[PDB]
């Protein structure tokens, strides 16, 4: 209701920082101040906000990589950097730190089950699954839903089976990928965050097996047989149901006093 002035079209990189600092870093609970790795997650959000909106409206403003940005952020507010560690060394700690945070994703399949939904990220060329690193104190299924909505604009809630996942450990990173069936293919899967996902498409399941079996160059190259088995166990069940359905659909009319 109360009307506020947009101070971000024409703004000093100096006052843009002071702003962003209050938005992200400066005003957070001291539990996310425990590690240097903790605080650098805000610096990562703030930098993604800067380059998502601030630099958008301000052509003149620099282009800031987390390196330069976080390094500038301290220059303006030295009272925010408590510890005697350089944000250079602290940021390489953070990058290596990320490499341990376990990913939780999803295997998005349609009712038909012939096709699987896979996404590719901006920098890369490899197709994989909608997936992301867990947050602070959030259950495996909730992190999957948060991360799949952020990546595909789909709230998976309904189809999230908890005991039906695929777990794999690729280079000290735990992947737990849930198996989802019944997703509508017609819906537009646009991602919700800028500069994260390049392309999202429905690759045909059979096509992939045939190309994976050739060994060329995807988490799908390890969870191949589990995924195929799941499909097999699902087509088997969904069709067995349409055989029982027709057996019923004929009984409830060959005798059946259907209403």
């Amino acid at each position: 209701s109360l009307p506020l002035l947009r101070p971000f079209e024409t703004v000093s990189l100096e006052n843009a920082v002071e702003d962003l600092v209050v938005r992200f870093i400066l005003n957070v609970p001291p539990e996310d101040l425990s590690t240097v790795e903790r605080v650098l997650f805000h610096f990562e959000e703030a930098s993604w906000f800067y380059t998502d909106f601030v630099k958008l409206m301000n052509p003149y403003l620099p282009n800031l990589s987390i390196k330069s940005f976080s390094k500038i952020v301290i220059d303006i507010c030295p009272l925010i950097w408590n510890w005697d560690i350089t944000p250079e060394n602290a940021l390489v700690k953070f990058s290596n730190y990320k490499k341990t945070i376990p990913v939780r994703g999803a295997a998005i399949f349609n009712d038909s089950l012939s096709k699987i939904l896979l996404l590719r990220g901006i920098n890369s060329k490899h197709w994989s699954f909608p997936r992301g690193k867990i947050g602070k104190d959030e259950d495996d299924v909730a992190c999957c839903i948060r991360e799949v909505k952020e990546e595909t604009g789909f709230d998976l809630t309904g189809f999230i089976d908890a005991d039906q996942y695929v777990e794999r450990n690729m280079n000290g990173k735990n992947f737990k990928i849930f198996l989802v069936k019944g997703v509508p293919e017609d819906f537009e899967f646009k991602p919700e965050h800028k500069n994260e996902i390049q392309a999202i498409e429905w690759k045909d399941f059979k096509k992939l097996s045939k190309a994976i079996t050739k060994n060329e160059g995807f988490l799908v190259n390890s969870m191949i047989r589990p995924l195929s088995l799941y499909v097999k166990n699902e087509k088997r069940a969904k069709d067995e149901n349409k055989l029982k359905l027709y057996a019923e659909e004929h009984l409830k009319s060959i005798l059946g006093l259907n209403k």
Binding site: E240, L243, K244, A247, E248, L251, I254, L255, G256
Partner: protein, 62 residues
């Protein structure tokens, strides 16, 4: 035709009868190894279309 399909028959009196189908006719339904929710198992059940209420097709044949 519909032989082997294990079906379940619910009745409005308060009884339920499971068992595998043996003969399908629009006037009569016959079941092999009919188990009743009253504690009765019979190997041969014959019931008419009129004395029937609800139906579900429990299992398909092997």
């Amino acid at each position: 035709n519909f032989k082997g399909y294990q079906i379940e028959i619910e009745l409005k009196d308060g009884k339920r009868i499971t068992g595998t189908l043996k003969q399908v006719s629009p006037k009569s339904l016959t079941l092999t190894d009919a188990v009743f929710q009253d504690g009765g198992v019979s190997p041969v059940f014959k019931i008419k279309a009129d004395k029937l209420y609800d139906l579900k097709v429990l299992k398909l044949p092997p």
